[PDB]
Chain A
């Protein structure tokens, strides 16, 4: 590493080299945090986490008990040991608390003054973070499994919602229009994710073992349907062209948005060319998941090699996205891990699981 510092000082290597190499080294040295703790307030398992995209300071967490906790991740104390204190809380005494489990919570991109939370109580609530009051509510005829706002859209502000209905809802936060729907799936839509690269590209994964990419501006259904075999087993499109041999319960675009990682209940993760949905045949081995709802997993950013952190039983499996090589198992949870969210500023990880714990993984040394 002194070689890295010397090369940076002498201009031999771009500082990009040191930055991404050290980010990768930090991610590889991920371990149970020696001096850090997260305050425990959820009475039930944490189903979702979200660190705000700008300044990466505050973290939302939705629990199976319906409460939403807002934590400050910064060590505002002077000690090396600190607990991520809870700033705010939609608790059981809040007038607008979710009646059932909160399954997805997401900070509004471009601004930390608002966030959103969808629950199995058939509601997508939009909260003002300052007053901590519901600015809006969208009701659905069937329970919400996931939702996502575009991390890129300066123009549109649509929330793509996947419920147990076979339709992907698009709720306009600009003047409230939840009527827009996308047809083409056949069972519950367990995951939805906007492309970080393209403004109007949305990937939706449903229990019909299919993943569809939509240009929501378009009037002609999905753009691409992901196919495991890319055409080896080709059939007229009524039941073929499946992404997995089970329910596809998780989506994640890579950092650049040029590839898509789909995890399904066939104990398989697959990497897809996001421009034509071709399977890249990256192996990843066996990725154990049996979740009946959406599975939240994230990818690394700002590193020499991209990593993907997938909940794997009661562990976090870290894989290399483009080679599939298994990095490691982060092993500190006592029950199945529901979500993991990656802090890209310091290569940190926060994992929420059914054991009512949010565990922080920090690079060692």
Chain B
């Protein structure tokens, strides 16, 4: 499972970094290029793929 992801907003490969703040149960995914940021709740079973998942889902939901 890759940790760096293509940004849904600027389509820059591996430009998204994921930070797991487990102490606060929050994952923050940020694109280095276009500076888009997204915050989602996470669990101890969560992974950066799950945070990027929640980001893609939030984008598609907001774009309806």
Contacts and interface: CB of A to CB of B under 8 A. Distances in A.
A64 B6 CA distance: 15
B63 A65 contact: yes
Nearest to B32: A292
Nearest to A121: B11
Given A43-B62, A65-B63, A92-B63, A143 B36 contact: no
A166 to B, nearest CB: 17
A223 B10 CA distance: 32
Interface in B1-45: 7-12, 32-37
Interface in A104-156: 120-122, 143
A101 interface: yes
SS of B interface (majority) = loop
B35 A100 contact: no
B8 A100 contact: yes
Contacts of A47: 34
B11 A143 contact: yes
A292 B15 CA distance: 11
B33 A292 contact: yes
A103 B11 CA distance: 12
B63 A64 contact: no
Given A65-B63, A92-B63, A45 B11 contact: no
A292 B30 CA distance: 13
Interface string A34-70: 0000000001110100000000000000001110000
A143 B37 CA distance: 20
Interface in A254-302: 291-293
Contacts of B11: 99-100, 120-122, 143
B62 A101 contact: no
Contact size class for A? 20 to 34
SS of A interface (majority) = loop
A43 B59 CA distance: 9
Contacts of B36: 44-45, 64, 101, 354
B58 to A, nearest CB: 10
B63 A120 contact: no
A122 B47 CA distance: 30
Nearest to B8: A100
Contact of B9 (A64, A92, A336): A64
Nearest to B11: A100
Nearest to B35: A354
B16 to A, nearest CB: 13
A121 to B, nearest CB: 6
Contacts of A43: 62-63
A122 B6 CA distance: 14
Interface string A64-94: 1110000000000000000000000000100
Given A100-B7, A100-B9, A64 B34 contact: yes
B35 A120 contact: no
A101 B32 contact: no
A65 B59 CA distance: 8
Contacts of B7: 100, 120
Contacts of A338: 35
A354 B59 CA distance: 16
Interface string B39-64: 00000000000000000000100111
Nearest to A354: B35
Interface of B: 7-12, 32-37, 59, 62-64
Interface of A: 43-45, 47, 64-66, 92, 99-101, 103, 120-122, 143, 291-293, 336, 338, 354
Given A121-B11, A292-B35, 10 more contacts: A43-B62, A44-B9, A44-B36, A45-B36, A47-B34, A64-B10, A65-B63, A100-B9, A120-B11, A143-B10
20 contacts: A43-B63, A44-B9, A47-B34, A64-B10, A64-B34, A92-B64, A100-B7, A100-B10, A100-B34, A101-B34, A101-B36, A103-B34, A120-B7, A120-B34, A121-B11, A122-B11, A143-B10, A143-B12, A293-B33, A354-B36
